[PDB]
Amino acid sequence: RYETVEMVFIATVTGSLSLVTVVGNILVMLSIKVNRQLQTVNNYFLFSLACADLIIGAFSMNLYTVYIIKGYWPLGAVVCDLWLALDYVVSNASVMNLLIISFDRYFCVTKPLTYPARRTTKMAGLMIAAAWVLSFVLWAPAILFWQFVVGKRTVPDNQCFIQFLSNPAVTFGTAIAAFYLPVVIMTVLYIHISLASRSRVMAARERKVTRTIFAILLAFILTWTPYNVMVLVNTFCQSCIPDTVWSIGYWLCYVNSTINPACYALCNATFKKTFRHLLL
């Protein structure tokens, strides 16, 4: 009635969100690999983003809930560092995946002969692997190694925070770069794609693909905006923002992962008709 019912409410809703994200991602990718009528690079990018989405959703929300259910890390550490690095690296990998989807779409639209037959299927997988390995080698070893660079795990055995986020400058730099640089690139590339498509103008399917990309971009930016807004606010003064609002903000930072599997069927007609068939 006072706190136990609220704890049950929060735990149940987070578990339901994790389960629905997992089932949506697995169903959409199973549809991708079973239908076999689609062999475009955009669909491979969608598959990679859905895999990253299920990983984010399941692992990140489960461990963030078991961290937030009490106020510390119940596990005996060790798993903390691995989960933190995995979550941050897969979030950055999803960001770079959406970045390279935007690059690919801009390249295809801006030039009718931008080697469109060079893509086939090997190039899509190569780009996906390149983005994944780039994010990995850029973030994960740093997470695992800069703690030893300082000299010891200053993080206690019950806490699960990041070493370099203690420095406000590192927080500000990583936030501004790894959010707004992709955001401004999306903005300029969306403007360029819109103008090129308008000048140029099968059309129904092209518009469907464009709407799908726009929906993914809008969902990502809308979900991840509040986190970076508050991060910037913390650069205005000291302790400008309370703690429970921070908890809720970083909680809906995963609403991108929640929305994407549903938005796939919401925007894509083939996904919409496949969803009913694969629910049974």
Binding site: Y64, Y72, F161, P168, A169, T235, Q238
Partner: protein, 65 residues
């Protein structure tokens, strides 16, 4: 005495609070896997039992860098 009142992306800010609150308490409070709120201030009690907020005492000229 002097203590760094806070930390910011620009730089540190050393201060000398008067003979009132003759103590430098430094606190870490971990709110998010990606956010640890930090304070460094003047107070008049060293023990300070903690609500999972790691704190330490200082009474020197540079102790909370």
């Amino acid at each position: 005495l002097t203590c760094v009142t806070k930390n910011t992306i620009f730089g540190i800010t050393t201060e000398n609070c008067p003979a009132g609150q003759n103590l430098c308490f430094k606190r870490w409070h971990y709110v998010i896997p990606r956010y640890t709120e930090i304070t460094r201030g003047c107070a008049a009690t060293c023990p300070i039992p903690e609500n999972y907020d790691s704190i330490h005492c200082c009474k020197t000229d540079k102790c909370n860098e």
